Design a protein around this nucleic acid. Sequence first.
RNA 1: CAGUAACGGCGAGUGAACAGGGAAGAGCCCAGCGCCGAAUCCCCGCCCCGCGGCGGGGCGCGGGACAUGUGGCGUACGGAAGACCCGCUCCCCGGCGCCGCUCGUGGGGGGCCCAAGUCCUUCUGAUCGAGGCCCAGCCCGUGGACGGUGUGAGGCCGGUAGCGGCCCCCGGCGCGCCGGGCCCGGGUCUUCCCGGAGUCGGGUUGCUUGGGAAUGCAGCCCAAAGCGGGUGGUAAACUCCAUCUAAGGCUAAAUACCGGCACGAGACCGAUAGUCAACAAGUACCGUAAGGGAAAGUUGAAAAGAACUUUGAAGAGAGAGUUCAAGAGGGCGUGAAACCGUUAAGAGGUAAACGGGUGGGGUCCGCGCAGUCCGCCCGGAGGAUUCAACCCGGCGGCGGGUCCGGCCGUGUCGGCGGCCCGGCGGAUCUUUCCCGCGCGGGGGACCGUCCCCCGACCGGCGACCGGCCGCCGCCGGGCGCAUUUCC
RNA 2: CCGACCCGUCUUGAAACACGGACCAAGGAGUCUAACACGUGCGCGAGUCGGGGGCUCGCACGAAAGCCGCCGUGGCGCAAUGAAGGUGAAGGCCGGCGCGCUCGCCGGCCGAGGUGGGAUCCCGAGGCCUCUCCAGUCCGCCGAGGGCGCACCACCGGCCCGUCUCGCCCGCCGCGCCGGGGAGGUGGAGCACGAGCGCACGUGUUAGGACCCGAAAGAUGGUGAACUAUGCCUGGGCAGGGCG
RNA 3: ACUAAUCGAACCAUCUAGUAGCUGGUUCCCUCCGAAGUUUCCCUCAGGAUAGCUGGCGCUCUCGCAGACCCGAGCCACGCA
RNA 4: AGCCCGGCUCGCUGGCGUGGAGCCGGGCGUGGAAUGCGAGUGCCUAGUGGGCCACUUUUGGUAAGCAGAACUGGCGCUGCG
RNA 5: CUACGCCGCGACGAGUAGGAGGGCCGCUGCGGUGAGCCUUGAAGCCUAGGGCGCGGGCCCGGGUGGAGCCGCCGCAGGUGCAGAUCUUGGUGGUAGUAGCAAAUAUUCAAACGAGAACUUUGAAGGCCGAAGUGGAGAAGGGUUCCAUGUGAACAGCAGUUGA
RNA 6: CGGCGGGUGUUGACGCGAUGUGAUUUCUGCCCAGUGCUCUGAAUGUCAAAGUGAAGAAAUUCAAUGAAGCGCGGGUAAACG
RNA 7: CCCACUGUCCCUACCUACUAUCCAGCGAAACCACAGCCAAGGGAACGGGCUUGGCGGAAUCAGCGGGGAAAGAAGACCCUG
RNA 8: CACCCACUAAUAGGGAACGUGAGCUGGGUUUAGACCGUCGUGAGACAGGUUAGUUUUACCCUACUGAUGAUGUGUUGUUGC
Lengths: 147, 210
Amino acid sequence: PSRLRKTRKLRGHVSHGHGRIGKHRKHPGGRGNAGGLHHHRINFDKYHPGYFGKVGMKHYHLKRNQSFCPTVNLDKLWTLVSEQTRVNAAKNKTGAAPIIDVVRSGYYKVLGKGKLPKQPVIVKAKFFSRRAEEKIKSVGGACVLVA
Amino acid sequence: APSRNGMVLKPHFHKDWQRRVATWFNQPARKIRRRKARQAKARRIAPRPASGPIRPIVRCPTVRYHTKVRAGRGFSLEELRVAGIHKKVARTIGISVDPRRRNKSTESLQANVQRLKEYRSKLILFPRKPSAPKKGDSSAEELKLATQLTGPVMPVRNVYKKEKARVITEEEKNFKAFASLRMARANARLFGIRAKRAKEAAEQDVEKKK
RNA sequence: CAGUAACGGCGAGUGAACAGGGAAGAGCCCAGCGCCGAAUCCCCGCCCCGCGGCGGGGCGCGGGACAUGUGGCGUACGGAAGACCCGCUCCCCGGCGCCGCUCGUGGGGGGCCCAAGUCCUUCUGAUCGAGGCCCAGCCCGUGGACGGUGUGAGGCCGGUAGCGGCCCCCGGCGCGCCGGGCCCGGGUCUUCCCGGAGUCGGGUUGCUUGGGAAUGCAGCCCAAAGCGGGUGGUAAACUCCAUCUAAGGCUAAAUACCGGCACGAGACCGAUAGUCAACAAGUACCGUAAGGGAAAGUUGAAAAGAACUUUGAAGAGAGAGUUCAAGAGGGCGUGAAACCGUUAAGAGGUAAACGGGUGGGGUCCGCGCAGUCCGCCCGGAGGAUUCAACCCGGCGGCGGGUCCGGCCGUGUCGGCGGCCCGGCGGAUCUUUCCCGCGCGGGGGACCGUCCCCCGACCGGCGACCGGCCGCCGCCGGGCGCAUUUCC
RNA sequence: CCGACCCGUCUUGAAACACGGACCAAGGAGUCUAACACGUGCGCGAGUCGGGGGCUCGCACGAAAGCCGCCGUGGCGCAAUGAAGGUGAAGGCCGGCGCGCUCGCCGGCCGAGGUGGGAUCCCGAGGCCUCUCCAGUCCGCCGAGGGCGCACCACCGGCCCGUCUCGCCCGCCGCGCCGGGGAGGUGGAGCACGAGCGCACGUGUUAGGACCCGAAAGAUGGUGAACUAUGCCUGGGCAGGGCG
RNA sequence: ACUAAUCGAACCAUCUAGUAGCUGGUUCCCUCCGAAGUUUCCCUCAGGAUAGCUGGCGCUCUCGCAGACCCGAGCCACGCA
RNA sequence: AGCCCGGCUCGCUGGCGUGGAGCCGGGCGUGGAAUGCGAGUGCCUAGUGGGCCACUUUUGGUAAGCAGAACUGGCGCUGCG
RNA sequence: CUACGCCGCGACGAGUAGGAGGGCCGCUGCGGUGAGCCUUGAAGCCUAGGGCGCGGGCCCGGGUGGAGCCGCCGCAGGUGCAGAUCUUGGUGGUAGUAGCAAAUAUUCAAACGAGAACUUUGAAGGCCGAAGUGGAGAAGGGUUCCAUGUGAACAGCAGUUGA
RNA sequence: CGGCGGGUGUUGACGCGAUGUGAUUUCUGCCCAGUGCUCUGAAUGUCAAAGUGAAGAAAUUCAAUGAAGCGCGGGUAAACG
RNA sequence: CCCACUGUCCCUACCUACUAUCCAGCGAAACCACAGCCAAGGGAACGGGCUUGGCGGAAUCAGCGGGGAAAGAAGACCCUG
RNA sequence: CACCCACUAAUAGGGAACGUGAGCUGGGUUUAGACCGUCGUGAGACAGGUUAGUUUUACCCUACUGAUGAUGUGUUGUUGC
Ligand SMILES: [Mg+2]
Ligand SMILES: [Mg+2]
Ligand SMILES: [Mg+2]
Ligand SMILES: [Mg+2]
Ligand SMILES: [Mg+2]
Ligand SMILES: [Mg+2]
Ligand SMILES: [Mg+2]
Ligand SMILES: [Mg+2]
Ligand SMILES: [Mg+2]
Ligand SMILES: [Mg+2]
Ligand SMILES: [Mg+2]
Ligand SMILES: [Mg+2]
Ligand SMILES: [Mg+2]
Ligand SMILES: [Mg+2]
Ligand SMILES: [Mg+2]
Ligand SMILES: [Mg+2]
Ligand SMILES: [Mg+2]
Ligand SMILES: [Mg+2]
Ligand SMILES: [Mg+2]
Ligand SMILES: [Mg+2]
Ligand SMILES: [Mg+2]
Ligand SMILES: [Mg+2]
Ligand SMILES: [Mg+2]
Ligand SMILES: [Mg+2]
Ligand SMILES: [Mg+2]
Ligand SMILES: [Mg+2]
Ligand SMILES: [Mg+2]
Ligand SMILES: [Mg+2]
Ligand SMILES: [Mg+2]
Ligand SMILES: [Mg+2]
Ligand SMILES: [Mg+2]
Ligand SMILES: [Mg+2]
Ligand SMILES: [Mg+2]
Ligand SMILES: [Mg+2]
Ligand SMILES: [Mg+2]
Ligand SMILES: [Mg+2]
Ligand SMILES: [Mg+2]
Ligand SMILES: [Mg+2]
Ligand SMILES: [Mg+2]
Ligand SMILES: [Mg+2]
Ligand SMILES: [Mg+2]
Ligand SMILES: [Mg+2]
Ligand SMILES: [Mg+2]
Ligand SMILES: [Mg+2]
Ligand SMILES: [Mg+2]
Ligand SMILES: [Mg+2]
Ligand SMILES: [Mg+2]
Ligand SMILES: [Mg+2]
Ligand SMILES: [Mg+2]
Ligand SMILES: [Mg+2]
Ligand SMILES: [Mg+2]
Ligand SMILES: [Mg+2]
Ligand SMILES: [Mg+2]
Ligand SMILES: [Mg+2]
Ligand SMILES: [Mg+2]
Ligand SMILES: [Mg+2]
Ligand SMILES: [Mg+2]
Ligand SMILES: [Mg+2]
Ligand SMILES: [Mg+2]
Ligand SMILES: [Mg+2]
Ligand SMILES: [Mg+2]
Ligand SMILES: [Mg+2]
Ligand SMILES: [Mg+2]
Ligand SMILES: [Mg+2]
Ligand SMILES: [Mg+2]
C-alpha cells in the first residue's frame, strides 16, 4: 500500500527528507561495495572483519553429496521411534531392547549432546561419537555400525 | 555506500537483466494445456496404462541417496533375458528397456526380475484380430476386467525391514564403535605406506647377510 | 543444488555442474567386416486402373547410372553361417457399404433458426423512469452476459442458455471383399566376423569458460595406436581399478515466441492520457539524403440545418420559423482561469497589495417585527370511552427439591456389543492356521485414539431445550358507566 | 490608526545591485523488482513452508478457490569448530576400594552448576472489627521478618572444536610412524532443556534508468562533393588605350 | 582552411533514460520531539565511511495507587547529578 | 557490594598455626554531608560533517568587518520589548 | 459506559535540516454495504447567498447544465504544485507603438463599378538607354500558360486587379 | 582487411619520390662532444623462439651455441642543433 | 618628413534629398517578481521598497541617453571536477 | 605619468563605480593570422618587441529637456501680485 508510506507525508516539503545542504545525489561514495579498502575501510573493518584475502586450500569440483552426513543427538534419539516402542521397552519384563535405525530416520552420525533415559537400546548408525557411544553403553545399550 | 551494520550484498543486476525477464502469467494456462494433453493421450491409448510403461526398481547413485530407491529408465537386458522376455517384444507389451544399464548385483537383478514377472502375471493382452483370439488372453478376463490404469504402473516404494526388539548380547556390548571407526580410518590411510615399508624391510632382510 | 564449488588489480564483481523431485518420454540407421549370378536405381516410349498433390501393375534383344560398389541381411544392446529343439504364431498399403456415429457429451468449418409485458395508471421532448398486476404473489428463466432502441430494458430487437433443431461440406477411426505386394521367428551348441585418420593426441598462439600448471574453440607445427583410445576438475612417472567407444547420420513430446492470422479478457489509460497515430497518420510537413514527423473526437432524438419579410454591394444584422433547448445555428455537448468590452456601486496626490482593530455604506439572510415551549398542580366550562378492582383467553419474564422428560460435561464399570456384526492409526507382537526361497505378500493378536451403544453414579439445567406448577407483567374480550379515567 | 521590503533557493549571512519567476489552464518528480537488516501483526511451532508439479463439469466470476502427504524432493531452522584430514557439546551428592595419590573401577539417586541482584508468588509473629466482657467458633485487610525465585544483568565454574605446554595410562582379529584418554593456558560467528519457519506491513541500505531534468564525450552502422577544396573530361568568355 | 548556414574531426539513427562527488526543482493539513558544521581514516579538501549530536520503537524496574464523602496512622524508594 | 565475629579450601606464598585470595555460616540500619531529581537498558535510525558572532584568554600581522585557537553563551534554527 | 468510550487533576506549548503520530483532509479505481441519490434533474461549472472546522477541507441555497454520482468498512495507486532559463496550449502590458524611407516621378480626363491615389483607355511628363527595366533559351519550377467568372481568405495600404 | 592486389607508371635517374631555403648580386665561417641518420662486421659483450647435449622416472632443470637489435668502431651540420 | 590641398580643426553656419514628425490604412518584437522621485543611515559593506528626513497632483507628446549595478549568453578570463 | 616650446593673472591639486563605451573612438592591454629574440626535444610559452584584427539594442519606467493640459475660483476674458 503506497498510502501508508513516507512519500505521502513528504508532499509540500521541498527536500523530500533528504536535506537542503547535502541533497540527494546519484552515487556519493561510489556504487555497490566500492572503496572497501580506501574510503569505506572503517565500515568494512568494523562490521566485516576477514573480508579481504585468501585463507585455506581451494578444492575444485566440490560435491556436497560426498560429504553429506546429517547428525542427531542423544537427547532427540528416542524421538525417531514411536511412543509405543519406548513404553513397551520400559514396561518389558525381559531385557529385550528396541533397535533405533537413524539411517532409516535420515541421520548418519549420532552425536552425544544430552542424556539418555535409563533403559537399554540398540542404535544402528554409520558413525558414532566417542561420548555418544559412552552414554549408550552407560545406559546398558549397544552401538552397532552400518555401511 | 555501507550504512552501519549490514550484510555485504552482491546483486547480479549489472547485466541488463530487464531484457530477459521470464514472467509466469501463462503458468495456469500451461497447466491446463498439459492436463488436456494428458487426457487426450490417455484416451488415445484406451486400455493401456495412462502413465506409460513399467519402470525398473533403481537405487539412487551417491552416498547421500543410496538408502532411497526410485524408478529407472528401463529394464536392463540381463533382467529381460533371465525373465525370458525378448528385448524387442518388451516395448511392444509395455515394458521400458534400457540397453546401457548394467547389473552389478544379484539382489537388484532379482528384484527387477520379480517385478517383471509380476507385471507379466498382471498383464492382459488383446488379440490382434478380436474375432481370432490366437494367444493373447481369454475373453472372460478382458471383457470387463480390462481397465485403463491411473498412476505409475506398480509404483516403486521404499520398504523398511522392521527388526523386533532383542536381548543385547555381551559381544555387542563389548564392541567398540568409535575405536573401530578410528582404526578403520587409520588403516585405510596408512595401508599403502605400510606396504612400502614392508617392501623395503624385506629387501634389506634378503641381503642382511653379506 | 546455489549466489554454492570456482574465477577475480582474489578488488569491483562474476559464477556453473552432479546427485534429488517433477513435465515429457522413443528410439534408431549407415560406412566398415562379410554373403547373395548388381540382387539395385533413374529416364524414355506402349497398354490398363486412376487423376486431382500424379501413383499402381505389366511390356520394351528401349537408353543410362553402377564392380572407382547399387540393393537385401547387419551395427557394438554384439552380428553372421551351420546344425539340434520348439513355435506358424498374421504385416502394412489404397477403395467399396454401414455402424460405434469422431465423444466432457459435433471431430472440424459454413449457413438459417428457437422464452417471456411494449399490459393498467402516470413523469417526459422521447422514455428503457415511478406506482400496480388476487391466487404467494404479471410472464419467462438451463436464458437476470452484452449491445441497440429519442433515459436508466431479463420480457421492443439482435443475441444470451440449452448432451437445442435443420441444411451444406470436409477429415481419422472396425467389419466382409477388392488390387497387389509380404516372408520364418525363438532358444542351445559349434565355427567365423567385428569398426569412422591430417583424426586423436602433443607443443605453441589467440579468443572463450566458474574450469583454476590451461573448460571449450580455432590457426600453425608435430603427428598416432589397437589387450588400443578417451575420461576419472593439480602438472609428472609407475601401478591397479572404474567408465565409455570419438573422429559418419536421422529422430516426436515436454520448451521458446514484443513479427503474422483469428479470438477472449483486464482492480490499465481516457483525447496534453493511452501506440507517433480514437480522425483522409507513418498522413501533412521538413531535409539532397540517410532520416525526422505532428496537430486534429463531441449540434441535435430526429436536419426538423432557419422558409418568408426587411437594410446593406456583400460580409453581416432585425423580425419570423424548427426544437425541450439555438442562452445546441455545420470546428455547433459543457464552457473555467488569464485577458478584454459595457453597465452598476465605491474610491483615488506618498505604486499597488497585505496583517490587526473599528466605523460608514451596500447586497442578502433571519416568515425578526409584540416573541417560545412543556411536566405537574389549582380554578372554570365541555366531551367521551370506560378508571381501579374482578372473570375468561393469549403471550412473555423469573423460580422450582429435576417437580417430569430431554439432556449436557467430566470421569466409570461389563464391554453384549467392531477387523464377518462400525472406523482410523502404531518403528507393538505373530503364520509357529495362508499362495513367493530353510526367504515375501496376507490374515490374526495387542496397543492408542474412536465410533455409536446398552445402563449407573458424580456436578448443572447452564447463555441446549420442552411439559407442569408458583409468582409477576403485558395484551384482547366481558363486567365495572361515574367524587374514577382520559381528551 | 498601528504594523507591514518579494517569493523560491544556495548560503555564516537575501529585501538585495545574487539567481529563477509577465499571466492563466492542464501535465510534472523517492516508483517497481530483487536481496538483505531490524521493528510490528498473523498462523503453526522443533518444526515450518507446496512457491514447482499433479488431481478436481477446464474456462461467467474461475488465470480464482479447494485438495495431495509414499508429492516435504527441497529451502530455512534443529551444531559447532578447523585451511584440512577430521572431531563434535551433562553434571552434582553419598559411598564403600588401589594409595579416594587432585586420580582409576561400580552402585544409588537427582538431571545443565553456583554467587549477588531480581517483577511475581508463598509462609508469616503481631495488628484492624461490633453494646461490653472471662469463652472459641468461620472466613477479610495491614503486616516486621522469612522462603521459592521468571526474564534479564554482572561474576565464578563446567562442556564441544582449533592450537600450545606438561605427563601418565588404556584398547586390539590389524602391535602399529595404530587408536583413545588426562591436566594447565589460549583462538571460536559455540553448548549450558531449543525459536524457528511462512505470510503481511513499515523503515533503512544496496543493484537496477532508480526522485525528476541536465553534459563535454565514447562506440556501432549508414547518408552526403546541389556549397565548398582539389584532379580529370567537354564547352563558353574576357571594351578601349599606354610602353614598345 | 573547406568537406550542404555544422569542422581542432560533418550529418543521421542506435548503444542511450550513457555517467555526474556539480547546478535547478521536488506537490495536503495539524500535533509531538528536534540537530550539525566536530573526532579518526580515505588520491580526501564542493564527497564519503566512522564516532558524536537526533528521532522512533520499546523493555526492566522504582514511589504509591488507599479509605464508598470524610479520615496519616530513630524510621520513611532502586538510583542519579 | 559496609563493618565486626567465627570456620573452611588452595597445586600460589612460606621459619611459623606465615601471607594472600576465595568460599561458608552469624551478628550489627542512627541507611553514616547539603541540595535536587524517578532511574536502568536494548534495537533501528535520519540530517549533518562549508559555519559565523560577542565577553574574557590568546597566536600571526602595522592593522583589518583579516587569518588561527581556548571557554561559555548566542545567531544559524528565533519571533517579541 | 461508540470501554478504540466517558470523566477528573496537574504541568507544559519557539523551531530550520530531520524523525514520528493523527487526519470524520483530498483524488482515481476494486471488493462489500447504504432496500443510498438521480430526467419532479447526476457530474462539472458560476455565485455581493447561509454556515461548519485550528487547518487540510466540507455541507447547504441560487443559477447554468443535461446522465450519471456519492457516504461508510476494507483494498490498490501513474494520488495533492507557484516555482525546475520546467512541457504543451492560451492570453496580456509593451502598443495602435517600432515601423510600411536602397535603385529621380508622377499628373489630367473618361469608362466600368456600391466603392478608384493604385484597374483599363486616351493625353502629358519621366525612367531603363542595345553590357536594357528589351527579345529568346539551358538548369530548376510544374500548369504558374490562355479565356471566363468571384471578391471570403492571400497579394504586410488598397484593388473593379492578380503568378 | 584481403589477392605478388593497387598509385607514381602510357614512367626509368635531364625520371619519380622526400625535404629545407626562397628571384638576381655577394657570401654562406668553426664544431661530429649530445641527439639523430648512415657505413663495417673484425676477434667481438649482451641477445628470444626453435634446434643440440647432459642430469632425472618424467614433468623439469642445467649447459653449450649466438639472428636482428643494442653495445664496440668510422662518416655526416644547405641533419637537429 | 616635405610640397600641394583642403571644414580634420580654430568654429561653427547654411542648403538639398530621404526620414524622423502629424494624419488615413496596416501593424510586430525584445523584455516584464511587483514596480518605478530623492538625501543619509543601517544592510550580503553602492536601495525603487526598509528607518529618519526632503516631500508627493490626473492623462499625455517630441526628444534624451544619468540610472533601472537595463537587455542580449547557465562568464570564453581565473579556480575546482 | 613625463618632458620641452610658447603665451599667461595663473597655467593648483583632486572626487563623482580609478565619473562618463545602448555617448564616441579603438591607439594600448586581452582571442583566433603572422614575424623576431629568449626558453622548450616537442606541442608550445614569454607584465619581451612587432603587424592585421565585426564595438550590437531604447519604442518601456524614471531622471532631465522642452510641449499640451489638469485641480479649485459659477462660465469666460483682460490686467496684475
Ligand atoms: Mg520540516
Ligand atoms: Mg557540504
Ligand atoms: Mg542456501
Ligand atoms: Mg561473464
Ligand atoms: Mg512423468
Ligand atoms: Mg553393401
Ligand atoms: Mg427475443
Ligand atoms: Mg440501453
Ligand atoms: Mg437491455
Ligand atoms: Mg446458440
Ligand atoms: Mg589428480
Ligand atoms: Mg495523443
Ligand atoms: Mg478534454
Ligand atoms: Mg468581408
Ligand atoms: Mg440548455
Ligand atoms: Mg458550445
Ligand atoms: Mg467586468
Ligand atoms: Mg539558488
Ligand atoms: Mg558567500
Ligand atoms: Mg530570499
Ligand atoms: Mg546590494
Ligand atoms: Mg547579475
Ligand atoms: Mg546560481
Ligand atoms: Mg527573468
Ligand atoms: Mg517560465
Ligand atoms: Mg495540476
Ligand atoms: Mg490453485
Ligand atoms: Mg529431505
Ligand atoms: Mg564462564
Ligand atoms: Mg540498516
Ligand atoms: Mg534519470
Ligand atoms: Mg542524458
Ligand atoms: Mg574513452
Ligand atoms: Mg561539383
Ligand atoms: Mg589511498
Ligand atoms: Mg554548493
Ligand atoms: Mg570544515
Ligand atoms: Mg576569526
Ligand atoms: Mg544553513
Ligand atoms: Mg537551538
Ligand atoms: Mg531569539
Ligand atoms: Mg509557555
Ligand atoms: Mg512546536
Ligand atoms: Mg505523479
Ligand atoms: Mg502551474
Ligand atoms: Mg515549492
Ligand atoms: Mg509610426
Ligand atoms: Mg517610414
Ligand atoms: Mg535616359
Ligand atoms: Mg533578358
Ligand atoms: Mg496569367
Ligand atoms: Mg492588403
Ligand atoms: Mg623549392
Ligand atoms: Mg649479433
Ligand atoms: Mg666536415
Ligand atoms: Mg538613494
Ligand atoms: Mg556557470
Ligand atoms: Mg558556460
Ligand atoms: Mg572608470
Ligand atoms: Mg553609460
Ligand atoms: Mg559600446
Ligand atoms: Mg587595435
Ligand atoms: Mg594574435
Ligand atoms: Mg586589414
Ligand atoms: Mg516616434
